Amino acid sequence: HHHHMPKIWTERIFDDPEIYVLRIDDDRIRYFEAVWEIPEGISYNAYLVKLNGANVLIDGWKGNYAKEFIDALSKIVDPKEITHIIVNHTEPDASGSLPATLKTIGHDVEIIASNFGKRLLEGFYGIKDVTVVKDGEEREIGGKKFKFVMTPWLHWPDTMVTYLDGILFSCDVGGGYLLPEILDDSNESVVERYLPHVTKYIVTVIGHYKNYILEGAEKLSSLKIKALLPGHGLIWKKDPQRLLNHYVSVAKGDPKKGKVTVIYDSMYGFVENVMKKAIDSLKEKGFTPVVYKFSDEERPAISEILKDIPDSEALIFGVSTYEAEIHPLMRFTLLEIIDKANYEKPVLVFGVHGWAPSAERTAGELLKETKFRILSFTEIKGSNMDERKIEEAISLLKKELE
Amino acid sequence: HHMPKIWTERIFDDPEIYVLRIDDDRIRYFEAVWEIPEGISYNAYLVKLNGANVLIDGWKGNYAKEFIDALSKIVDPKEITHIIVNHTEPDASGSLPATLKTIGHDVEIIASNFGKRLLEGFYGIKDVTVVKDGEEREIGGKKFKFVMTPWLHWPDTMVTYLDGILFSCDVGGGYLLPEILDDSNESVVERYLPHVTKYIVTVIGHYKNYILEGAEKLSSLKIKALLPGHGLIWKKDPQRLLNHYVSVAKGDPKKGKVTVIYDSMYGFVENVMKKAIDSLKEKGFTPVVYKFSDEERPAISEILKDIPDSEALIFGVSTYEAEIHPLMRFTLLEIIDKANYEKPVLVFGVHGWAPSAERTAGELLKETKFRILSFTEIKGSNMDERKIEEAISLLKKELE
Ligand SMILES: [Cl-]
Ligand SMILES: [Cl-]
Ligand SMILES: [Cl-]
Numbered sequence: 186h187h188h189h190m191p192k193i194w195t196e197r198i199f200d201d202p203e204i205y206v207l208r209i210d211d212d213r214i215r216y217f218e219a220v221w222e223i224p225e226g227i228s229y230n231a232y233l234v235k236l237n238g239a240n241v242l243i244d245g246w247k248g249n250y251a252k253e254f255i256d257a258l259s260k261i262v263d264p265k266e267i268t269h270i271i272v273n274h275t276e277p278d279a280s281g282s283l284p285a286t287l288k289t290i291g292h293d294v295e296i297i298a299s300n301f302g303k304r305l306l307e308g309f310y311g312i313k314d315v316t317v318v319k320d321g322e323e324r325e326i327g328g329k330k331f332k333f334v335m336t337p338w339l340h341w342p343d344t345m346v347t348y349l350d351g352i353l354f355s356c357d358v359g360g361g362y363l364l365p366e367i368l369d370d371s372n373e374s375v376v377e378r379y380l381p382h383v384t385k386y387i388v389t390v391i392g393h394y395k396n397y398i399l400e401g402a403e404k405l406s407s408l409k410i411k412a413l414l415p416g417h418g419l420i421w422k423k424d425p426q427r428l429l430n431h432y433v434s435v436a437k438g439d440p441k442k443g444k445v446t447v448i449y450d451s452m453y454g455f456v457e458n459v460m461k462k463a464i465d466s467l468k469e470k471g472f473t474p475v476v477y478k479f480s481d482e483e484r485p486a487i488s489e490i491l492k493d494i495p496d497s498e499a500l501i502f503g504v505s506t507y508e509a510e511i512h513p514l515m516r517f518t519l520l521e522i523i524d525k526a527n528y529e530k531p532v533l534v535f536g537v538h539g540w541a542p543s544a545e546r547t548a549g550e551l552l553k554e555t556k557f558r559i560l561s562f563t564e565i566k567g568s569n570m571d572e573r574k575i576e577e578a579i580s581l582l583k584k585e586l587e
Numbered sequence: 588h589h590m591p592k593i594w595t596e597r598i599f600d601d602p603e604i605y606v607l608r609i610d611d612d613r614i615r616y617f618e619a620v621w622e623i624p625e626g627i628s629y630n631a632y633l634v635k636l637n638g639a640n641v642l643i644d645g646w647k648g649n650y651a652k653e654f655i656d657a658l659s660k661i662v663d664p665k666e667i668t669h670i671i672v673n674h675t676e677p678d679a680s681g682s683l684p685a686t687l688k689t690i691g692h693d694v695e696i697i698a699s700n701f702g703k704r705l706l707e708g709f710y711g712i713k714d715v716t717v718v719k720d721g722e723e724r725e726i727g728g729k730k731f732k733f734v735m736t737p738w739l740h741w742p743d744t745m746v747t748y749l750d751g752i753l754f755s756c757d758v759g760g761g762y763l764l765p766e767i768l769d770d771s772n773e774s775v776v777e778r779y780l781p782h783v784t785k786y787i788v789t790v791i792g793h794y795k796n797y798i799l800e801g802a803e804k805l806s807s808l809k810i811k812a813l814l815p816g817h818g819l820i821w822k823k824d825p826q827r828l829l830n831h832y833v834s835v836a837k838g839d840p841k842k843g844k845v846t847v848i849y850d851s852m853y854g855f856v857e858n859v860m861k862k863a864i865d866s867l868k869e870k871g872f873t874p875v876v877y878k879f880s881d882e883e884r885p886a887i888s889e890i891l892k893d894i895p896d897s898e899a900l901i902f903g904v905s906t907y908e909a910e911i912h913p914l915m916r917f918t919l920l921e922i923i924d925k926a927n928y929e930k931p932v933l934v935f936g937v938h939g940w941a942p943s944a945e946r947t948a949g950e951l952l953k954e955t956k957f958r959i960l961s962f963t964e965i966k967g968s969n970m971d972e973r974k975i976e977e978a979i980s981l982l983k984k985e986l987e
Contacts, residue, residue, distance in 0.1 A: 219852045219881045219905075220913050248854065277853035309855075311968030342940060393908050452619045453677040454648065455709075481614050505619070508741060513620050513887075517917050524908070540742065568711035 187213065191250070194368060195257050198420065199412075202329060202350060203235040206420065207257050209250055210364040217362070221389040222486035225363045225382060229278055230416050232354055233261060236327025241269040243347060243354045244416055248281025255282070255289050264289045269326060272298040272315075273356035274344050275305040279416050284310050297324075299335055302343035318345070334404060338397040340390055351411030358401065359428050360417030361386045369420045370428070379419055380431055385492035386417065387435045392491065392525030398436035402429050434495075438528040441496040443473045445582075448490060449503025449535075450479040450515045459535055459565045460503045462572055466579040479514045487521055494526035498586050500557070502532065503565065504548045506539030511548050519551055529556040531585050533578050535563045560585055591650070594768060595657050598820065599812075602729060602749065603635040606820065607657050609650050610764040617762070621789040622886035625763045625782060629678060630816050632754055633661055636727025641669040643747060643754045644816055648681025655682070655689050664689045669726060672698040672715075673756035674744045675705040679816050684710050697724070699735060701743035718745070734808075736801045738794040751811035758801065759828055760817030761786045769820045770828070779819055780831055785892035786817065787835045792891065792925030798836035802829060838928040840898040843873045845982070848890060849903025849935075850879035850912040859935055859965045860903045862972060866979040879914040887921055894926035898986050900957070902932065903965070904948050906939025911948055919951050929956040931985050933978050937965045960985055 194208040212226040229250070232243040240262055246254040258264060267290050272280060275298065283306075287294075296315045298306060303315040318324065320335040332348040339358050347354040361383035370376050391398060406429070413425035421428045445467055451457035457480065467474045475493050477485040494500070502519075505512050511519070534549055552559055563578045594608040608630045617623045629650070632643040640662055646654040658664060667690050672680060675698065683706075687694070696715045698706060703715040718724065720735040732748035739758050747754040761783035770776050791798060813825035821828045845867055851857035857880070867874045875893050877885040894900070902919075905912045911919075934948055949959055963978050 214881050216879075216881050216884060218907075219850050219879050281853070307968075309967040450619050453681075479616075479619050481616050481619050484616060512618075513917070513921060516920075517913070520916075521913065567709040 191253070192364070193253060193257050195260060196368065198368065198414075198422070199352065202352070204352070204414075205233040205235075205261050206368060206414070207231045207233065207246075207254065207261075208368070209246055209253060209257070211247065211250075212364060213249075217389065217488075221385075221488040223362050223385075223488065227278075227362050227386075227417050228364055230414070230418075230420070231279075231282075232414060233258065234327075234349065235262065236329055239268045239327030240266050241271060241326060242267055242286065243271045244273055244279045244356055245282035245286060247278045251282045251285040255285055258286070259289075265291060267294055269295045269297060271331075271347050271354070272296060272302055272306065273347055273354060274341060274416070275302050275309060276341065276357075277309065279356060280306070280309065283312070287312070297333075299333075299337075299343050299345045301337075301341070302345070305343055332408075334408070336397075336401040336404065338394040339401050340394055346405065348408055351409045353405070353408070353410055353413050353425070355413055356416035357390065358405075359413045359415035359421065359425075359432065360390075361415075361419065363418060365419050370423045370425075376419070376427075381492065383418065383428070383431060384435050384495060385488055387432060388491040388495060388525050389488050395436040398432055402433050405429065436495075438495045438530065440498040440530070442498065443471060444475065444493075444497045445472050445499045445501060446475045446477070446490070446493045446497040447501040447503070448477045448518060449501075450505045450512055451503070452481075452505040452507065452512065455567055456503045456505050456535070456537065456565055459563075459570060459575060460501075462575050463501060463503075463533075463535065463579060466576055470579065470583050472583075479518075484514070487518060490518060491521060491525055494522065494528065497530060499530055499582055500532045501582075502534050502536075502548060502552070504534065504536040506537040506541055508539065508541060510539065510541045510545040511551070515548065519548060523551070523555055527556050529558065531582060532557045532559050533561060533563065533582055534559055535565050535575075535578070537565045591653070592764070593653060593657050595661060596768060598768065598814075598822070599752065602752075604752070604814075605633040605635070605661050606768065606814070607631045607633065607646075607654070607661075608768070609646050609653060609657075611647065611650075612764065617789065617888075621785075621888040623762050623785075623888065627762050627817055628764055630814070630818075630820070631679075631682075632814060633658065634727075634749065635662065636729055639668045639727030640666050641671060641726060642667055642686070643671045644673055644679045644756055645682035645686060647678045651682045651685040655685055658686070659689075665691055667694055669695045669697065671731075671747050671754070672696060672702055672706065673747060673754060673816070674741060675702050675709060676741060676757075677709070679756055680706070680709065683712070687712075697733075699743050699745045701737075701741070702745070705743050732808075734804065736797070736804070738797040739801055740791045740794055746805070748808055751809050752814060753805070753808070753810050753812065753825075754814050756816035757790065759813050759815035759821070759825075759832065761815075761819065763818060765819050770823045770825075776819070776827075781892060783818065783828070783831060784835050784895060785888055787832065788891040788895060788925050789888050795836040798832055802833050802836075805829075835895045838895045838930065840930070841896045842898065843871060844875065844893075844897050845872050845899050845901060846875045846877070846890070846893045846897040847901045847903070848877045848915075848918060849901075850905050850915050851903070852881070852905045852907075852912065855967055856903045856905055856935070856937065856965055859970065859975060860901075862975050863901060863903075863933075863935065863979060866976055870979065870983050872983075879912070879918075884914070887918060890918060891921060891925055894922060894928065897930065899931045899933070899982055901982075902934050902936075902948060904934065904936040906937050906941050909942045909945040911936075911946075915948070919948060923951065923955050927956050929958075931982065932957045932959050933982055934959055934962045935965050935975075935978070936962065
């Protein structure tokens with residue numbers, strides 16, 4: 186139960202151009218896109234640029250906060266004075282407030298989007314009068330030059346970024362989960378605590394298209410960037426390159442020394458017994474394991490597993506079998522890793538030798554179609570398990586990472 | 588500090604039979620997957636006979652010490668002579684190593700063929716008497732009959748018949764920690780049965796055809812009592828429990844029941860499904876609704892429990908990247924695996940820009956027993972509500 190209304194920020198963050206952020210902190214939402222566990226919440230950031238002869242709204246808020254958005258907006262400008270609305274991306278977490286915004290303005294305005302964005306505004310809302318902008322197209326508005334850069338598949342085909350005097354309104358690109366205690370990247374401690382939640386956002390929202398992050402960062406690199414103002418999380422006025430470098434590093438899967446992520450199901454405790462030993466062996470050898478275990482008492486968040494993949498030196502899977510080859514949570518977890526975090530990293534598989542029908546795909550053969558490099562398979566036995574084979578696998582991994 | 592509740596009670600006089608039941612209120616996910624906030628009991632039995640004492644099954648391994656202590660209150664463990672293992676899964680057999688140690692001398696362990704193999708694999712136990720289908724054994728002056736019921740839900744599964752009393756372990760079990768031991772209270776029985784259905788679909792669902800086979804196999808035996816490894820003991824009306832098992836396995840429907848399952852990423856699916864659900868209610872159906880949204884996430888075990896007695900299902904599906912929404916994928920795969928029934932379905936789905944390569948909900952349902960009466964596209968603005976009305980009307984007609 187929430188004791189207070191969501192926090193709203195409304196603040197001028199630049200003098201020239203005169204730019205305001207309108208940010209609402211969604212601490213109601215539990216599952217982003219109705220799937221990714223985000224107990225930390227997410228912000229929706231829209232922007233208002235007040236110019237000479239024009240007032241430009243950039244993006245908006247999720248639809249359940251439409252009324253709050255209009256109230257907030259009306260505190261910094263008479264909505265009737267709005268002339269342009271730029272829609273970088275049409276997903277309803279950014280565009281949900283648009284119908285109520287259009288009604289409140291009460292007259293036609295120029296709505297600007299990508300080609301695909303125009304089609305989607307029609308499909309979602311019935312909005313038909315939209316100006317399509319092309320890649321690199323410039324537009325003079327209120328005496329300033331706006332430039333629009335298409336960055337498709339980050340993470341929809343309609344995605345673009347808006348460039349104004351070195352200031353990039355990037356919507357999802359550069360977004361992150363978490364409700365930071367400040368607006369921007371001015372505090373180092375804030376930045377360090379925020380970045381893991383940026384990783385979590387990249388992998389969950391953009392991970393399937395992680396190769397396009399590399400494309401997009403390179404495309405954006407050619408522009409003079411003085412600040413990056415995304416649709417979620419922190420605004421980067423001080424060091425936007427650090428954010429871009431983080432995005433690229435997550436996309437490439439640059440590893441953190443000693444990090445090994447160990448993911449397993451233990452249906453009855455036999456997998457646990459082997460994996461506890463695998464984990465102890467790792468700690469003995471200088472590694473710092475991150476452990477996700479599906480047991481009869483505990484159940485990790487898939488969003489948290491995914492977040493830890495990119496900077497792992499390696500993964501280890503422990504797979505319960507018995508009657509079937511892959512049990513439901515392991516299967517879900519593998520399929521999501523395949524979909525969102527397909528990296529060229531070494532992997533150990535430990536598995537129970539069950540009596541599953543031969544036609545059933547094993548965890549190994551699912552993994553064998555990915556970029557992951559399975560070093561070895563180790564059988565999880567019951568009473569006559571040979572602990573030396575566990576030590577063997579961990580030593581094999583240590584040598585591989587050496 | 589709180590301790591899980593243990594029941595030890597003599598439940599028959601001749602033969603002299605005791606139940607030892609522990610109510611597991613710590614477990615959250617049965618088999619590490621099925622959401623069971625209601626918990627589950629482990630029921631073992633001791634039969635005290637003339638010249639023998641026979642333990643039948645046991646408890647989960649984390650309760651081994653509680654098991655020995657409970658057992659020691661009704662018999663000196665050294666006086667045990669036989670242990671019958673209906674099924675080797677650790678929720679029933681985890682206590683076996685500690686029990687053998689406490690007994691302190693050799694006993695005859697009896698199991699099925701696959702049972703003996705699994706006892707060796709799990710625990711290194713090699714001295715086990717294998718009994719065959721229909722084999723009878725004289726023990727302590729009584730005749731014990733063994734009946735193989737494989738794939739309920741493992742190939743080692745058997746049941747033990749003793750003068751009309753069936754020790755059935757998993758067969759006839761259920762989730763929930765019932766307020767009493769047995770089937771002597773109607774309202775307790777009523778509240779309990781849906782938890783039996785939940786247990787059947789989740790644990791045995793994939794092999795539901797073998798329930799029907801098992802039912803007619805036991806049909807040649809006069810069952811006066813059913814003593815399963817989980818949940819309620821049935822002494823008054825074990826037939827009622829058997830009929831329930833069969834009805835779930837057949838998927839006998841409750842008239843008017845439609846289960847509606849959907850994900851709504853941003854409210855567009857929600858808007859279509861709200862009209863669908865309303866249309867069902869106005870036509871006299873009683874929908875059961877499961878919504879994956881950005882605030883709510885139903886338990887898959889609850890969705891599964893409602894499938895067998897639904898007249899029909901309705902799915903509302905969002906497109907996601909190349910495929911469908913991950914939670915609906917997971918849910919479809921489990922329904923197909925555990926609840927593959929010959930029932931009608933409506934699909935409502937958003938039109939995506941997904942790669943044509945990847946699988947849709949309909950393709951997933953192709954090799955199953957479900958039949959899709961129609962597919963209806965979910966749109967934002969300009970959604971033709973008449974399409975929703977006609978889909979529901981079509982379903983009503985199909986169900987007459
Ligand atoms: Cl296990
Ligand atoms: Cl939706
Ligand atoms: Cl899945």
